[PDB]
Design a protein around this ligand. Structure first.
Ligand SMILES: O=c1ccn([C@@H]2O[C@H](COP(=O)(O)O)[C@@H](O)[C@H]2O)c(=O)[nH]1
Ligand SMILES: [Mn+2]
Ligand SMILES: [Mn+2]
Length: 179
């Protein structure tokens, strides 16, 4: 019974918490033990949904939050109908306006460090990358940041609030050092 586990459950909505628990169980991880990661997954989920809510109406297909099998089925449908290259790793969204997959990243460190690690690890010049930090920085493939400033600003605002709530419970340093 960790403080972080109870913090997460009162910080994120129940739909996000339940999708995060499903994800972790599918990874074969336990939210009660790997509690910093439970928090990271919830954060990632929320950002991805707030980001899809930045579009015009039909702009994004949402891949993040589905069951693994259905997630790849939808990836396949998109690849097999837009002719775009099938990514090696599950992305987070598909952008129907710009016809590309996006992988959104949330990091507690330097956005450049994490961008590179992700750049190499995806190994797919095709898939767009967009990184936010808990200090308000972002970095995107080709400096093309997809959404207008307002929709991104509110994401950065929410992450800073999450940081403060953690710091006010002495959970921040432990969560930062665990990445
Ligand atoms: O197989 C996976 C895929 C993703 N993640 C986690 O889900 C979040 C989103 O990953 P990404 O979509 O930014 O790669 C990160 O906090 C990352 O640790 C995993 O633990 N295992
Ligand atoms: Mn993902
Ligand atoms: Mn991502």
């Amino acid at each position: 019974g960790s403080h972080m586990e109870d913090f997460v459950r009162q910080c994120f909505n129940p739909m996000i918490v339940e999708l995060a628990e499903k994800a972790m169980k599918e990874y074969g991880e336990d939210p009660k033990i790997e509690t910093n990661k439970f928090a990271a997954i919830c954060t990632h989920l929320e950002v991805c949904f707030m980001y899809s809510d930045g579009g015009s109406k039909h702009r994004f297909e949402i891949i993040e939050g589905r069951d693994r099998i259905m997630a790849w089925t939808v990836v396949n449908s998109i690849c097999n109908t837009t002719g775009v290259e099938k990514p090696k790793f599950l992305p987070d969204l598909y952008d129907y306006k710009e016809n590309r997959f996006i992988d959104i990243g949330v990091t507690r460190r330097e956005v450049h460090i994490y961008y590179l690690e992700k750049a190499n690890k995806i190994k797919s010049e095709k898939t767009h990358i967009h990184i936010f930090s808990f200090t308000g920085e972002e970095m995107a493939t080709k400096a093309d940041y997809t959404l207008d400033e307002e929709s991104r600003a509110r994401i950065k605002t929410r992450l800073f609030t999450i940081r403060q709530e953690m710091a006010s419970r002495s959970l921040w340093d432990s969560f930062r050092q665990s990445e």
